[PDB]
User: Fold triosephosphate isomerase from Gallus gallus.
Amino acid sequence: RKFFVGGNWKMNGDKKSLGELIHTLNGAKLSADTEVVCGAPSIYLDFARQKLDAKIGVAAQNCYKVPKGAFTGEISPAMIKDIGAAWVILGNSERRHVFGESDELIGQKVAHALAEGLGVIACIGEKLDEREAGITEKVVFEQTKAIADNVKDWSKVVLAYEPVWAIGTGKTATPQQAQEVHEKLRGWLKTHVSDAVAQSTRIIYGGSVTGGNCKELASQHDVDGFLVGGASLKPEFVDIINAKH
Amino acid sequence: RKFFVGGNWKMNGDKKSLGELIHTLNGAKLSADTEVVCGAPSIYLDFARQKLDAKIGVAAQNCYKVPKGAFTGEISPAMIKDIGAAWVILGNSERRHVFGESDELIGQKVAHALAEGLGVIACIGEKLDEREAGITEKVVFEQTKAIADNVKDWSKVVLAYEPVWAIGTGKTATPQQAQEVHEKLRGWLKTHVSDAVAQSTRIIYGGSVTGGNCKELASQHDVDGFLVGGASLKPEFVDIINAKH
Assistant:
Protein backbone atom coordinates (compact mmCIF):
# COMPACT_ATOMS: atom_id res chain seq x y z
CA ARG A 1 0.00 0.00 0.00
CA LYS A 2 1.66 3.22 -1.13
CA PHE A 3 2.16 5.63 1.82
CA PHE A 4 -0.26 8.53 1.47
CA VAL A 5 -0.18 12.07 2.93
CA GLY A 6 -2.83 14.68 2.24
CA GLY A 7 -2.32 18.25 3.45
CA ASN A 8 -5.63 20.02 4.26
CA TRP A 9 -5.00 23.76 4.18
CA LYS A 10 -8.55 24.43 5.57
CA MET A 11 -9.58 28.14 5.43
CA ASN A 12 -6.12 29.58 5.20
CA GLY A 13 -3.99 31.34 2.64
CA ASP A 14 -3.96 33.92 -0.05
CA LYS A 15 -2.13 33.84 -3.45
CA LYS A 16 1.15 35.25 -2.08
CA SER A 17 1.44 32.97 0.95
CA LEU A 18 0.15 29.86 -0.99
CA GLY A 19 2.42 30.65 -3.97
CA GLU A 20 5.31 30.61 -1.49
CA LEU A 21 4.17 27.32 0.09
CA ILE A 22 3.81 25.75 -3.40
CA HIS A 23 7.34 26.88 -4.40
CA THR A 24 8.64 25.13 -1.25
CA LEU A 25 6.95 21.85 -2.08
CA ASN A 26 7.97 21.97 -5.75
CA GLY A 27 11.60 22.64 -4.81
CA ALA A 28 11.72 20.02 -2.09
CA LYS A 29 12.95 16.50 -2.24
CA LEU A 30 9.88 14.43 -1.64
CA SER A 31 9.92 10.64 -1.45
CA ALA A 32 8.82 9.06 -4.69
CA ASP A 33 7.28 6.34 -2.51
CA THR A 34 4.75 8.85 -1.08
CA GLU A 35 1.47 9.94 -2.74
CA VAL A 36 1.10 13.67 -1.83
CA VAL A 37 -2.19 15.63 -2.38
CA CYS A 38 -2.89 19.19 -1.13
CA GLY A 39 -6.46 20.31 -0.31
CA ALA A 40 -6.78 23.97 -1.22
CA PRO A 41 -9.66 26.45 -0.44
CA SER A 42 -12.10 26.26 -3.38
CA ILE A 43 -11.28 29.83 -4.45
CA TYR A 44 -7.54 28.83 -4.85
CA LEU A 45 -8.01 25.34 -6.47
CA ASP A 46 -7.30 26.40 -10.06
CA PHE A 47 -4.23 28.52 -9.01
CA ALA A 48 -2.93 25.58 -6.96
CA ARG A 49 -3.36 22.99 -9.73
CA GLN A 50 -1.60 25.34 -12.22
CA LYS A 51 1.36 25.97 -9.91
CA LEU A 52 1.98 22.63 -8.30
CA ASP A 53 4.22 20.03 -10.01
CA ALA A 54 2.16 17.25 -11.62
CA LYS A 55 3.37 14.51 -9.21
CA ILE A 56 1.51 16.41 -6.32
CA GLY A 57 -2.32 15.92 -6.58
CA VAL A 58 -4.96 18.59 -5.72
CA ALA A 59 -7.99 17.95 -3.60
CA ALA A 60 -11.15 20.00 -3.06
CA GLN A 61 -12.12 20.27 0.60
CA ASN A 62 -15.84 19.64 0.00
CA CYS A 63 -18.37 19.06 -2.79
CA TYR A 64 -22.09 18.57 -3.27
CA LYS A 65 -24.00 15.50 -4.45
CA VAL A 66 -25.32 16.45 -7.93
CA PRO A 67 -23.58 18.02 -11.01
CA LYS A 68 -25.50 21.30 -11.17
CA GLY A 69 -28.54 23.13 -9.92
CA ALA A 70 -29.79 25.75 -7.48
CA PHE A 71 -27.36 25.26 -4.57
CA THR A 72 -25.77 28.68 -3.98
CA GLY A 73 -22.41 28.32 -2.15
CA GLU A 74 -21.68 24.69 -3.31
CA ILE A 75 -19.42 23.17 -6.04
CA SER A 76 -19.79 19.82 -7.78
CA PRO A 77 -17.36 16.99 -8.81
CA ALA A 78 -17.83 18.23 -12.43
CA MET A 79 -16.42 21.60 -11.57
CA ILE A 80 -13.45 20.10 -9.56
CA LYS A 81 -12.47 17.85 -12.47
CA ASP A 82 -12.82 20.81 -14.82
CA ILE A 83 -10.03 22.63 -12.90
CA GLY A 84 -7.88 19.47 -12.95
CA ALA A 85 -8.15 18.38 -9.29
CA ALA A 86 -8.33 14.63 -8.78
CA TRP A 87 -9.58 14.28 -5.22
CA VAL A 88 -12.13 15.56 -2.73
CA ILE A 89 -12.03 15.35 1.08
CA LEU A 90 -15.46 14.33 2.41
CA GLY A 91 -16.86 13.91 5.88
CA ASN A 92 -14.17 15.95 7.66
CA SER A 93 -14.64 16.70 11.35
CA GLU A 94 -15.58 20.34 10.76
CA ARG A 95 -18.07 19.48 8.00
CA ARG A 96 -19.76 16.95 10.36
CA HIS A 97 -19.67 18.81 13.71
CA VAL A 98 -19.42 22.53 12.86
CA PHE A 99 -21.58 22.41 9.67
CA GLY A 100 -23.86 19.49 10.64
CA GLU A 101 -23.43 17.23 7.58
CA SER A 102 -25.04 13.87 8.28
CA ASP A 103 -23.79 10.33 7.53
CA GLU A 104 -26.52 10.05 4.90
CA LEU A 105 -25.46 13.26 3.11
CA ILE A 106 -21.69 12.34 3.29
CA GLY A 107 -22.70 8.95 1.86
CA GLN A 108 -24.54 10.56 -1.05
CA LYS A 109 -21.55 12.84 -1.72
CA VAL A 110 -19.12 9.84 -1.80
CA ALA A 111 -21.25 7.90 -4.32
CA HIS A 112 -21.47 10.91 -6.57
CA ALA A 113 -17.78 12.01 -6.47
CA LEU A 114 -16.75 8.38 -7.29
CA ALA A 115 -19.27 8.05 -10.15
CA GLU A 116 -17.88 11.31 -11.44
CA GLY A 117 -14.40 9.80 -11.48
CA LEU A 118 -12.86 11.58 -8.51
CA GLY A 119 -10.82 9.94 -5.77
CA VAL A 120 -12.28 10.39 -2.26
CA ILE A 121 -10.47 10.90 1.09
CA ALA A 122 -13.36 9.81 3.41
CA CYS A 123 -13.01 10.83 7.08
CA ILE A 124 -14.35 9.10 10.16
CA GLY A 125 -13.71 9.76 13.95
CA GLU A 126 -15.22 9.78 17.42
CA LYS A 127 -15.65 12.67 19.85
CA LEU A 128 -13.97 12.96 23.29
CA ASP A 129 -17.18 11.94 25.06
CA GLU A 130 -17.50 8.87 22.80
CA ARG A 131 -13.89 7.80 23.30
CA GLU A 132 -14.39 8.13 27.10
CA ALA A 133 -17.74 6.24 26.98
CA GLY A 134 -15.71 3.46 25.37
CA ILE A 135 -17.92 3.44 22.23
CA THR A 136 -15.16 4.40 19.71
CA GLU A 137 -15.60 1.13 17.73
CA LYS A 138 -19.37 1.44 17.53
CA VAL A 139 -19.10 5.05 16.33
CA VAL A 140 -16.46 4.58 13.60
CA PHE A 141 -17.90 1.35 12.25
CA GLU A 142 -21.27 3.18 11.94
CA GLN A 143 -19.64 6.04 9.95
CA THR A 144 -17.60 3.56 7.88
CA LYS A 145 -20.75 1.52 6.95
CA ALA A 146 -22.41 4.79 5.76
CA ILE A 147 -19.47 5.33 3.40
CA ALA A 148 -19.07 1.62 2.37
CA ASP A 149 -22.74 1.38 1.36
CA ASN A 150 -21.90 4.03 -1.26
CA VAL A 151 -18.65 2.70 -2.64
CA LYS A 152 -18.69 0.32 -5.61
CA ASP A 153 -14.97 0.64 -6.41
CA TRP A 154 -12.61 0.97 -3.46
CA SER A 155 -9.51 1.65 -5.56
CA LYS A 156 -10.06 5.45 -5.46
CA VAL A 157 -11.00 5.61 -1.72
CA VAL A 158 -8.63 6.44 1.13
CA LEU A 159 -10.11 6.33 4.64
CA ALA A 160 -8.89 8.90 7.16
CA TYR A 161 -9.36 8.20 10.85
CA GLU A 162 -9.33 11.57 12.56
CA PRO A 163 -10.36 11.44 16.25
CA VAL A 164 -12.13 14.79 16.91
CA TRP A 165 -10.26 15.28 20.18
CA ALA A 166 -6.97 15.29 18.21
CA ILE A 167 -7.83 17.95 15.63
CA GLY A 168 -6.07 21.25 16.07
CA THR A 169 -5.76 20.56 19.86
CA GLY A 170 -2.17 19.36 19.87
CA LYS A 171 -3.29 16.13 21.63
CA THR A 172 -2.09 13.56 19.06
CA ALA A 173 -3.36 9.98 19.37
CA THR A 174 -0.52 7.80 20.63
CA PRO A 175 0.98 5.27 18.10
CA GLN A 176 -0.89 2.48 19.90
CA GLN A 177 -4.24 4.32 19.97
CA ALA A 178 -4.00 4.98 16.18
CA GLN A 179 -2.90 1.39 15.41
CA GLU A 180 -5.73 -0.20 17.48
CA VAL A 181 -8.44 1.64 15.45
CA HIS A 182 -6.70 1.21 12.08
CA GLU A 183 -6.46 -2.48 12.69
CA LYS A 184 -10.10 -2.71 13.75
CA LEU A 185 -11.21 -0.71 10.72
CA ARG A 186 -9.18 -2.95 8.41
CA GLY A 187 -10.87 -6.03 9.90
CA TRP A 188 -14.28 -4.39 9.40
CA LEU A 189 -13.30 -4.05 5.68
CA LYS A 190 -12.13 -7.70 5.63
CA THR A 191 -15.41 -9.04 6.99
CA HIS A 192 -17.84 -6.63 5.32
CA VAL A 193 -16.28 -6.11 1.93
CA SER A 194 -13.40 -8.56 1.21
CA ASP A 195 -9.87 -9.32 2.30
CA ALA A 196 -8.65 -7.88 -1.00
CA VAL A 197 -10.16 -4.52 -0.20
CA ALA A 198 -8.90 -4.76 3.43
CA GLN A 199 -5.38 -5.36 2.22
CA SER A 200 -5.19 -2.68 -0.49
CA THR A 201 -7.16 0.22 1.09
CA ARG A 202 -5.05 2.96 2.69
CA ILE A 203 -6.18 4.02 6.16
CA ILE A 204 -4.48 7.27 7.15
CA TYR A 205 -4.44 9.03 10.53
CA GLY A 206 -5.23 12.70 11.06
CA GLY A 207 -5.12 14.86 14.21
CA SER A 208 -2.15 16.98 15.27
CA VAL A 209 0.47 15.28 13.09
CA THR A 210 3.73 17.22 13.19
CA GLY A 211 7.34 16.75 11.95
CA GLY A 212 8.11 15.83 15.57
CA ASN A 213 5.82 12.84 15.96
CA CYS A 214 5.24 11.50 12.46
CA LYS A 215 8.01 8.83 12.30
CA GLU A 216 6.78 6.86 15.28
CA LEU A 217 3.18 6.99 14.05
CA ALA A 218 4.27 5.99 10.49
CA SER A 219 6.02 2.89 11.96
CA GLN A 220 2.72 1.31 13.01
CA HIS A 221 1.71 -1.52 10.74
CA ASP A 222 -1.80 -0.39 9.72
CA VAL A 223 -1.05 3.38 9.52
CA ASP A 224 -0.76 4.13 5.87
CA GLY A 225 -0.03 7.80 6.03
CA PHE A 226 -1.54 10.99 7.32
CA LEU A 227 -4.11 13.70 6.85
CA VAL A 228 -2.32 16.83 7.91
CA GLY A 229 -3.91 20.16 8.87
CA GLY A 230 -2.01 22.98 10.64
CA ALA A 231 1.43 21.53 9.80
CA SER A 232 0.44 21.37 6.05
CA LEU A 233 1.04 25.15 6.02
CA LYS A 234 4.62 24.95 7.40
CA PRO A 235 7.91 23.61 5.80
CA GLU A 236 7.76 20.69 8.21
CA PHE A 237 5.06 19.31 5.88
CA VAL A 238 8.06 18.10 3.77
CA ASP A 239 9.26 15.99 6.75
CA ILE A 240 5.83 14.36 7.21
CA ILE A 241 5.76 13.35 3.46
CA ASN A 242 9.20 11.84 4.14
CA ALA A 243 8.28 10.11 7.43
CA LYS A 244 9.37 6.58 6.33
CA HIS A 245 12.86 7.80 5.41
CA ARG B 1 -30.94 55.14 -6.48
CA LYS B 2 -28.87 53.31 -9.14
CA PHE B 3 -30.60 50.33 -10.74
CA PHE B 4 -28.84 47.17 -9.64
CA VAL B 5 -28.98 43.72 -11.24
CA GLY B 6 -27.07 40.83 -9.72
CA GLY B 7 -26.92 37.49 -11.59
CA ASN B 8 -26.48 34.43 -9.32
CA TRP B 9 -25.18 31.53 -11.33
CA LYS B 10 -25.61 29.18 -8.28
CA MET B 11 -23.93 25.74 -8.88
CA ASN B 12 -23.71 25.99 -12.59
CA GLY B 13 -21.15 26.23 -15.28
CA ASP B 14 -17.72 25.23 -16.35
CA LYS B 15 -14.90 27.28 -17.95
CA LYS B 16 -16.18 26.75 -21.55
CA SER B 17 -19.78 27.76 -20.87
CA LEU B 18 -19.05 30.56 -18.34
CA GLY B 19 -16.32 31.78 -20.78
CA GLU B 20 -18.97 32.03 -23.50
CA LEU B 21 -21.44 33.76 -21.20
CA ILE B 22 -18.69 36.22 -20.22
CA HIS B 23 -17.70 36.98 -23.84
CA THR B 24 -21.45 37.76 -24.50
CA LEU B 25 -21.71 40.14 -21.54
CA ASN B 26 -18.44 41.92 -22.33
CA GLY B 27 -19.56 42.69 -25.86
CA ALA B 28 -23.16 43.61 -24.99
CA LYS B 29 -24.90 46.95 -25.07
CA LEU B 30 -25.49 47.28 -21.32
CA SER B 31 -27.13 50.31 -19.86
CA ALA B 32 -24.70 52.90 -18.71
CA ASP B 33 -27.07 53.49 -15.73
CA THR B 34 -27.25 49.87 -14.43
CA GLU B 35 -24.85 48.41 -11.76
CA VAL B 36 -24.20 44.72 -12.73
CA VAL B 37 -22.62 42.02 -10.56
CA CYS B 38 -22.17 38.32 -11.31
CA GLY B 39 -22.22 35.73 -8.45
CA ALA B 40 -19.89 32.96 -9.67
CA PRO B 41 -19.14 29.49 -8.12
CA SER B 42 -16.16 29.86 -5.63
CA ILE B 43 -13.99 27.63 -7.84
CA TYR B 44 -14.45 30.08 -10.77
CA LEU B 45 -14.30 33.44 -8.91
CA ASP B 46 -10.73 34.20 -9.97
CA PHE B 47 -11.43 33.09 -13.60
CA ALA B 48 -14.65 35.16 -13.62
CA ARG B 49 -12.89 38.27 -12.34
CA GLN B 50 -9.98 37.90 -14.81
CA LYS B 51 -12.34 37.49 -17.81
CA LEU B 52 -15.23 39.98 -17.05
CA ASP B 53 -14.79 43.66 -17.93
CA ALA B 54 -13.84 45.84 -14.95
CA LYS B 55 -17.23 47.65 -15.16
CA ILE B 56 -18.93 44.39 -14.10
CA GLY B 57 -18.58 43.45 -10.46
CA VAL B 58 -18.00 39.93 -9.15
CA ALA B 59 -19.72 38.53 -6.11
CA ALA B 60 -18.98 35.48 -4.02
CA GLN B 61 -22.05 33.29 -3.30
CA ASN B 62 -21.26 32.78 0.39
CA CYS B 63 -18.45 33.40 2.91
CA TYR B 64 -17.70 32.59 6.55
CA LYS B 65 -17.54 34.85 9.54
CA VAL B 66 -13.80 35.00 10.44
CA PRO B 67 -10.61 35.67 8.27
CA LYS B 68 -8.92 32.26 8.65
CA GLY B 69 -9.19 29.05 10.64
CA ALA B 70 -10.07 25.41 10.76
CA PHE B 71 -13.22 25.70 8.59
CA THR B 72 -12.79 23.12 5.83
CA GLY B 73 -14.92 23.96 2.79
CA GLU B 74 -15.40 27.66 3.61
CA ILE B 75 -13.85 30.82 2.22
CA SER B 76 -13.41 34.21 3.91
CA PRO B 77 -13.89 37.92 3.00
CA ALA B 78 -10.09 38.18 2.95
CA MET B 79 -9.72 35.55 0.21
CA ILE B 80 -12.60 37.09 -1.74
CA LYS B 81 -10.85 40.50 -1.72
CA ASP B 82 -7.53 38.80 -2.61
CA ILE B 83 -9.12 37.53 -5.88
CA GLY B 84 -10.55 41.03 -6.74
CA ALA B 85 -14.25 40.33 -6.04
CA ALA B 86 -16.07 43.23 -4.35
CA TRP B 87 -19.37 41.63 -3.24
CA VAL B 88 -20.82 38.63 -1.35
CA ILE B 89 -24.40 37.24 -1.42
CA LEU B 90 -25.52 36.36 2.12
CA GLY B 91 -28.67 34.70 3.42
CA ASN B 92 -29.88 33.46 0.01
CA SER B 93 -32.94 31.08 0.11
CA GLU B 94 -30.88 27.90 -0.41
CA ARG B 95 -28.36 28.85 2.37
CA ARG B 96 -31.34 29.44 4.68
CA HIS B 97 -33.68 26.56 3.83
CA VAL B 98 -31.40 23.87 2.33
CA PHE B 99 -28.20 24.34 4.31
CA GLY B 100 -29.86 25.59 7.50
CA GLU B 101 -28.04 28.94 8.06
CA SER B 102 -29.80 30.83 10.84
CA ASP B 103 -30.40 34.55 11.20
CA GLU B 104 -27.74 34.76 13.92
CA LEU B 105 -25.13 33.26 11.63
CA ILE B 106 -26.16 35.42 8.65
CA GLY B 107 -25.97 38.49 10.89
CA GLN B 108 -22.38 37.59 11.98
CA LYS B 109 -21.33 37.04 8.36
CA VAL B 110 -22.76 40.48 7.34
CA ALA B 111 -20.81 42.25 10.09
CA HIS B 112 -17.61 40.46 9.14
CA ALA B 113 -17.96 40.92 5.37
CA LEU B 114 -18.56 44.61 5.81
CA ALA B 115 -15.74 44.99 8.32
CA GLU B 116 -13.39 43.60 5.64
CA GLY B 117 -14.68 46.10 3.08
CA LEU B 118 -16.89 43.88 0.86
CA GLY B 119 -20.31 45.07 -0.36
CA VAL B 120 -23.10 42.66 0.76
CA ILE B 121 -26.29 41.60 -1.08
CA ALA B 122 -28.42 40.43 1.86
CA CYS B 123 -31.40 38.29 1.08
CA ILE B 124 -34.69 37.81 3.00
CA GLY B 125 -38.04 36.18 2.16
CA GLU B 126 -41.01 34.28 3.34
CA LYS B 127 -42.27 30.79 2.52
CA LEU B 128 -45.64 30.07 0.88
CA ASP B 129 -47.14 28.93 4.22
CA GLU B 130 -46.15 32.20 5.91
CA ARG B 131 -47.62 34.25 2.92
CA GLU B 132 -50.95 32.25 3.22
CA ALA B 133 -51.02 32.77 6.98
CA GLY B 134 -50.83 36.61 6.54
CA ILE B 135 -47.42 36.89 8.25
CA THR B 136 -45.18 38.05 5.35
CA GLU B 137 -44.48 41.39 7.14
CA LYS B 138 -43.60 39.67 10.46
CA VAL B 139 -41.05 37.33 8.79
CA VAL B 140 -39.32 39.85 6.41
CA PHE B 141 -39.02 42.43 9.23
CA GLU B 142 -37.51 39.97 11.73
CA GLN B 143 -35.02 38.69 9.06
CA THR B 144 -34.20 42.31 8.08
CA LYS B 145 -33.68 43.30 11.81
CA ALA B 146 -31.11 40.49 12.25
CA ILE B 147 -29.18 42.02 9.29
CA ALA B 148 -29.78 45.68 10.18
CA ASP B 149 -28.64 45.26 13.74
CA ASN B 150 -25.27 44.16 12.31
CA VAL B 151 -24.78 46.89 9.71
CA LYS B 152 -22.69 49.91 10.68
CA ASP B 153 -22.48 51.37 7.21
CA TRP B 154 -25.25 51.11 4.71
CA SER B 155 -23.29 52.38 1.63
CA LYS B 156 -22.38 48.85 0.78
CA VAL B 157 -25.60 47.02 1.44
CA VAL B 158 -28.17 45.99 -1.16
CA LEU B 159 -31.23 44.25 0.24
CA ALA B 160 -32.72 41.44 -1.92
CA TYR B 161 -36.28 40.28 -1.40
CA GLU B 162 -36.76 36.81 -2.71
CA PRO B 163 -40.05 35.11 -1.75
CA VAL B 164 -39.18 31.42 -1.48
CA TRP B 165 -42.29 30.32 -3.42
CA ALA B 166 -41.03 32.27 -6.45
CA ILE B 167 -37.52 30.76 -6.70
CA GLY B 168 -36.98 28.24 -9.47
CA THR B 169 -40.78 27.76 -9.76
CA GLY B 170 -41.70 30.24 -12.51
CA LYS B 171 -44.31 31.70 -10.13
CA THR B 172 -43.10 35.25 -10.20
CA ALA B 173 -44.53 37.73 -7.72
CA THR B 174 -46.83 40.18 -9.49
CA PRO B 175 -45.58 43.80 -9.68
CA GLN B 176 -48.18 44.67 -7.05
CA GLN B 177 -47.01 41.90 -4.58
CA ALA B 178 -43.33 42.95 -5.10
CA GLN B 179 -44.07 46.66 -4.71
CA GLU B 180 -46.03 45.92 -1.50
CA VAL B 181 -43.08 44.23 0.26
CA HIS B 182 -40.45 46.66 -1.10
CA GLU B 183 -42.46 49.65 0.01
CA LYS B 184 -42.97 48.23 3.51
CA LEU B 185 -39.26 47.28 3.89
CA ARG B 186 -38.29 50.83 2.83
CA GLY B 187 -40.71 52.11 5.52
CA TRP B 188 -39.17 49.81 8.14
CA LEU B 189 -35.74 51.25 7.16
CA LYS B 190 -37.00 54.86 7.58
CA THR B 191 -38.22 54.23 11.10
CA HIS B 192 -35.61 51.80 12.45
CA VAL B 193 -32.48 53.20 10.82
CA SER B 194 -33.04 56.65 9.23
CA ASP B 195 -34.70 58.36 6.27
CA ALA B 196 -31.41 58.94 4.41
CA VAL B 197 -30.69 55.17 4.61
CA ALA B 198 -34.26 54.33 3.43
CA GLN B 199 -33.83 56.67 0.43
CA SER B 200 -30.44 55.42 -0.85
CA THR B 201 -30.53 51.70 -0.10
CA ARG B 202 -31.38 49.60 -3.10
CA ILE B 203 -34.00 46.92 -2.58
CA ILE B 204 -34.04 44.41 -5.42
CA TYR B 205 -36.39 41.61 -6.31
CA GLY B 206 -35.46 37.96 -6.96
CA GLY B 207 -37.58 34.95 -7.87
CA SER B 208 -38.21 33.88 -11.43
CA VAL B 209 -37.24 37.12 -13.15
CA THR B 210 -37.09 36.69 -16.95
CA GLY B 211 -36.69 38.94 -19.99
CA GLY B 212 -40.49 38.77 -20.46
CA ASN B 213 -41.51 40.06 -17.02
CA CYS B 214 -38.67 42.28 -15.96
CA LYS B 215 -40.09 45.56 -17.42
CA GLU B 216 -43.37 45.48 -15.40
CA LEU B 217 -41.51 44.72 -12.21
CA ALA B 218 -38.89 47.38 -12.88
CA SER B 219 -41.44 50.21 -13.33
CA GLN B 220 -42.56 49.76 -9.70
CA HIS B 221 -41.65 52.67 -7.55
CA ASP B 222 -39.67 50.83 -4.85
CA VAL B 223 -38.07 48.02 -6.99
CA ASP B 224 -34.47 49.04 -7.60
CA GLY B 225 -33.36 46.05 -9.60
CA PHE B 226 -33.19 42.31 -9.57
CA LEU B 227 -31.39 39.30 -8.28
CA VAL B 228 -31.66 36.90 -11.18
CA GLY B 229 -31.14 33.13 -10.82
CA GLY B 230 -31.80 30.83 -13.83
CA ALA B 231 -32.03 33.63 -16.48
CA SER B 232 -28.50 34.95 -15.53
CA LEU B 233 -27.05 31.98 -17.37
CA LYS B 234 -28.75 33.04 -20.63
CA PRO B 235 -28.45 35.84 -23.29
CA GLU B 236 -31.68 37.41 -21.95
CA PHE B 237 -29.78 38.49 -18.83
CA VAL B 238 -28.74 41.44 -21.03
CA ASP B 239 -32.46 42.38 -21.48
CA ILE B 240 -32.96 42.30 -17.65
CA ILE B 241 -29.93 44.66 -17.26
CA ASN B 242 -31.67 46.84 -19.80
CA ALA B 243 -35.15 46.39 -18.25
CA LYS B 244 -35.77 50.20 -18.26
CA HIS B 245 -35.10 50.85 -22.01
Summary: Chain B touches chain A at residues 8, 10-15, 39, 41-47, 60-62, 64, 68-76, 78-80, 82-83, 89, 92, 94-95, 98-100, 167-168, 229-230 (CB under 8 Å). DSSP finds eleven helices and eight strands in chain B. The radius of gyration of chain B is 17 Å.
